[PDB]
Amino acid sequence: NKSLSALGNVISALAEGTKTHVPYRDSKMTRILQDSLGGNCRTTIVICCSPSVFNEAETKSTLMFGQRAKTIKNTVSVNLELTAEEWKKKYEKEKEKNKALKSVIQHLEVELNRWRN
Amino acid sequence: NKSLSALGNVISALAEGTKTHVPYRDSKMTRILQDSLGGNCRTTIVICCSPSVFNEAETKSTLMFGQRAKTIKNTVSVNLELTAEEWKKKYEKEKEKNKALKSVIQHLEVELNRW
Amino acid sequence: ADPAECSIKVMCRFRPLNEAEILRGDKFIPKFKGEETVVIGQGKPYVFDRVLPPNTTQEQVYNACAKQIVKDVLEGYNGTIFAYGQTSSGKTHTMEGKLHDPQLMGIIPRIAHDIFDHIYSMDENLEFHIKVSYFEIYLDKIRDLLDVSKTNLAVHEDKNRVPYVKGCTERFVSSPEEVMDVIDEGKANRHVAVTNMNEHSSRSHSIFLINIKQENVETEKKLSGKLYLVDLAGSEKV
Amino acid sequence: ADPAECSIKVMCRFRPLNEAEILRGDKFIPKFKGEETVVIGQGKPYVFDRVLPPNTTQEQVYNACAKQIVKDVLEGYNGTIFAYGQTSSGKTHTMEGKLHDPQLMGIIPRIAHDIFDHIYSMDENLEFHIKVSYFEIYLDKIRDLLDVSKTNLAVHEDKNRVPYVKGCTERFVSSPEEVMDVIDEGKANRHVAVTNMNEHSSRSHSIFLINIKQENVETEKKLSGKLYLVDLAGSEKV
Ligand SMILES: Nc1ncnc2c1ncn2[C@H]1O[C@@H](COP(=O)(O)OP(=O)(O)O)[C@H](O)[C@@H]1O
Ligand SMILES: Nc1ncnc2c1ncn2[C@H]1O[C@@H](COP(=O)(O)OP(=O)(O)O)[C@H](O)[C@@H]1O
Numbered sequence A: 001n002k003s004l005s006a007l008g009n010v011i012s013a014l015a016e017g018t019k020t021h022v023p024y025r026d027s028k029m030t031r032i033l034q035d036s037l038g039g040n041c042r043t044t045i046v047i048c049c050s051p052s053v054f055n056e057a058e059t060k061s062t063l064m065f066g067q068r069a070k071t072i073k074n075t076v077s078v079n080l081e082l083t084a085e086e087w088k089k090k091y092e093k094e095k096e097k098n099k100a101l102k103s104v105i106q107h108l109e110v111e112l113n114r115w116r117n
Numbered sequence B: 001n002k003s004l005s006a007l008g009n010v011i012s013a014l015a016e017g018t019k020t021h022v023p024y025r026d027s028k029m030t031r032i033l034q035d036s037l038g039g040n041c042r043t044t045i046v047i048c049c050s051p052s053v054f055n056e057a058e059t060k061s062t063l064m065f066g067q068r069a070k071t072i073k074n075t076v077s078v079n080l081e082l083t084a085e086e087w088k089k090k091y092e093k094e095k096e097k098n099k100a101l102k103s104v105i106q107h108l109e110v111e112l113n114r115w
Numbered sequence C, D: 001a002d003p004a005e006c007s008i009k010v011m012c013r014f015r016p017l018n019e020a021e022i023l024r025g026d027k028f029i030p031k032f033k034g035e036e037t038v039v040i041g042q043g044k045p046y047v048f049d050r051v052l053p054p055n056t057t058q059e060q061v062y063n064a065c066a067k068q069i070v071k072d073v074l075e076g077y078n079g080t081i082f083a084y085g086q087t088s089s090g091k092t093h094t095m096e097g098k099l100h101d102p103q104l105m106g107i108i109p110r111i112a113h114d115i116f117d118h119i120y121s122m123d124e125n126l127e128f129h130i131k132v133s134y135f136e137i138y139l140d141k142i143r144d145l146l147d148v149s150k151t152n153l154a155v156h157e158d159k160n161r162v163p164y165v166k167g168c169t170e171r172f173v174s175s176p177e178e179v180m181d182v183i184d185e186g187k188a189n190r191h192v193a194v195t196n197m198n199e200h201s202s203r204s205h206s207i208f209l210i211n212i213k214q215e216n217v218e219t220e221k222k223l224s225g226k227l228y229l230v231d232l233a234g235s236e237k238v
Helices: A003-016 A028-032 A034-038 A053-069 A084-116 B002-016 B028-032 B034-038 B053-069 B084-109 C019-023 C058-065 C067-073 C091-095 C107-121 C176-189 C197-201 D019-024 D058-065 D067-075 D091-095 D107-121 D176-189 D197-202
Strands: A042-049 A073-076 B042-049 B073-076 B079-081 C004-007 C009-014 C030-033 C037-040 C050-052 C079-085 C126-128 C130-138 C141-144 C155-157 C163-165 C171-173 C204-216 C222-231 D004-007 D009-014 D030-033 D037-040 D050-052 D079-084 D130-138 D141-144 D155-157 D163-165 D171-173 D205-216 D222-231
Touching (some): A003 A028, A003 A034, A003 A053, A028 C155, A028 C163, A028 C204, A042 A053, A042 A073, A042 C067, A042 C091, A053 C009, A053 C037, A084 B084, B002 B028, B002 B053, B028 B034, B028 D155, B028 D163, B028 D205, B042 B053, B042 B073, B042 D067, B042 D091, B053 D009, B053 D037, B053 D079, C009 C058, C050 C058, C058 C067, C058 C107, C067 C079, C067 C107, C091 C107, C107 C130, C107 C204, C107 C222, C171 C176, C176 C204, C197 C204, D009 D058, D050 D058, D058 D067, D067 D079, D067 D107, D067 D205, D067 D222, D079 D091, D091 D222, D107 D205, D107 D222, D171 D176, D176 D205
Parallel strands (some): B042 D009, C009 C050, C079 C222, D079 D222
Antiparallel strands (some): B073 D004, B079 D222, C030 C037, C126 C204, C130 C141, C130 C171, C130 C204, C155 C163, C204 C222, D030 D037, D130 D141, D130 D205, D155 D163, D205 D222
C-alpha cells in the first residue's frame, strides 16, 4: 500500500490548506481522484469500520482519516460543453459588460468627485 | 526598382523608430514582407557581398543596409490557436475582473446613496 | 458564473460483529449518539456527516450517501463516492453488496437503477449518453477489467489538465441492466490471473466510472458529469 | 499579457573573388575581425550578428543562418530569410545554390530537408500540413510560378489585417522530395516569356513560401508558422 500512502498524503496535505504540491502524482489513483480529492466535484467518503476491540487500533486510524477528510473543501461547478466558438463569443460578451461597467464606474467617480468632484 | 525602394523606405523608417506611415504600401512586396519588417516574425537577412574593390561602393551601401535592419525590433508571438477550453479560461478570469469590478462599484456606490 | 465551496462529506458505517467475533465473545465498542456522532469507549466523540450503525440497511446508506450525487451528476456536476476502511470492515458490502439482490445490493447497483430511473422520466428533449468504465489498480498498475489484456494503462491529462485513465474500455449503456452486465463482466475478468481474490481485493482498488453527458436539443445547452464510484484497498497498517 | 521583442539579425556573407575578377587582379578589400566584424581598408567597423568569409561553405551559412528558423517556425513562430546585395554577389547561390548537390545546396534545399527531418522525430500526437506556394515579383506585378497562366496576382488581407498574395497556387507537401519538385517546377516556368534569364531575375524577386500548421490530436492545440524564403533582385545603383 503506497496508493493509500499516496491517498493519505493527499488528504492530510489537503486538510491543511497547503494545497501546494499536494502529492497528487504520488500514485496512479491520487491522480485519477485528483478532481475528487480537491477540485470540481462533490465527494462523499463512506469510511468502513469494525466494532470489535481487536480492531480498535485500526478503527481509530480509519476514523481519523474521516476526521481530517471532513475538512477538505471542493470548488464545485456544473460542467458546460461548448465549442471554442461559443467560448470566444461568451468571452466577448463578458468583455462587453467589462467595458460597460467601466463607464458606470467612471460615471459615479466623476459625479462624486464632480458631484462633489 | 520599386520593390527595393519600398524596402529601402520601410527599413530606414523602422531603423529610426518612426513606424507611423512606414511605407509598406509603397509596393506589393513590402506588403507581403509587412509582418516580416516590423511585426510578428523572427527574421534573418543574409547580405551577400563581393570582395572586389571594384565594387567597393555597393558593398559599403549594402553594409549600411545591413547596419540599418539590425536596429529594427519585431514582436515575436507563437501563433497558437486558442483551445475551446482555453478561451473558457479567458472568460473565467475576465469574470473575476468583472466581479471585482461590481465590487469596485458596490463600495464606490455605497457613498453615492449615502449622499 | 460562480462556483461554490463544499466540504467533502464523510459517512461512518459500522459493521456487525461477525460469526468469528461473536464466538470469541467480543463486545461492541462503539456507542452511537444521534445521527452523526460516535463514541469509542471513554474518549472524545467522533462527529461525521452521518454515522451509519450496523442496522442501517443498504437502501438507507444509499439514500444518505449517494441518492443526491446521482442527481448532481445528471445535472453537470462531478460526483465521487468511495469506500475507505480496513480489510473485512465493509467497503465492498457498501459499494457493491449482493449485486443482484433487491434487498442487499449496494451503491453501484443502486446508482445503476437511479440514473436510468431519473433519465427515463425526463423530457424527450433531453438526450443522455451514459458510458461506463471498469478498471482495477494493483501495485500501482491499472488493469482494465473489461479488457484483461490491457494491464499497464497510463493516466494522461485531457484538454483542460484533468487526470484520466487513457485507453481503458468505454461501454455505452442504455439501461440499469446493461450497466449490471458491465459489472458482472469485470467481476469475472478480475479473476483472470488471480490465485487468491481475497488477497487480491485486500490489496486492489476497484474503480467504476459512469461518464454522463446530457444535451438539450431545444436550447442546445450541453453538460457532462463524471461519477467515480471507488472501492479502495485495505488500509491496515504495517 | 505577452509577445517578446528581439531584432532582425543580419549576417554578412562575402563571396570569393571570381575568375573574371581574378584575371583583372582585383584587390581584396574586406578586413574581418573575430566573427561579427569587418572593415573595408581604412573605415569604421560594420558589426553584424555574424560574418561569413569566402571560405564559408553552404553548410556553415545554413548553420549560421537558417538552422534556428526551422525550429522557430515549427514552434508556431513566423520565419523569414532573404538575401540582399548587388547582382552577381551570391544571393541565389546562397538562397538556392546547386539545388540537388548535397554539398552545394543552399538554404532552401536544406530547409525542406530539415522541416520533415524534424517532423519525423516530432511528437506523435500532432498532425502537420505544410502548404507551399512559389511566385515572383517583377515590375511590382506578382507572377504565380506554379501557373504561368496567372500573371497579375493581387495582394489581399486576412481577418487580423496581414497581407498576402491572393488566388496564388497552394501545393500540399509531406516530404522534402515534394518540396523540391515545386522549386524545380517553378524554376523552370520562370522561363516562360523570359528572353535572357540572367537579366530578368537579376531584376526580379522570387519568394518561396512554406506554411506549416500543426495540431496535437491529444490536447487539440493547433499551431501555425509561416516561412518566407525570398531572394531579392539585384540591389545595384542606377
Ligand atoms: N448480515 C449483515 N448485515 C449488514 N451488514 C453486514 C452483514 N454481514 C456483514 N456485513 C458488513 O460486513 C462487511 C463485510 O464486507 P467487508 O469484509 O467489510 O468488505 P472489505 O473487505 O471491502 O472491507 C461489509 O462491509 C458490511 O458492512
Ligand atoms: N564561394 C563560391 N565559390 C564558387 N562560386 C561561388 C561562390 N559564391 C558564389 N558563387 C557562385 O554563384 C555565382 C555568383 O552569382 P549569382 O549566384 O548568380 O548571384 P546573384 O545573381 O544572386 O547575385 C557565381 O557565378 C558562382 O558560380
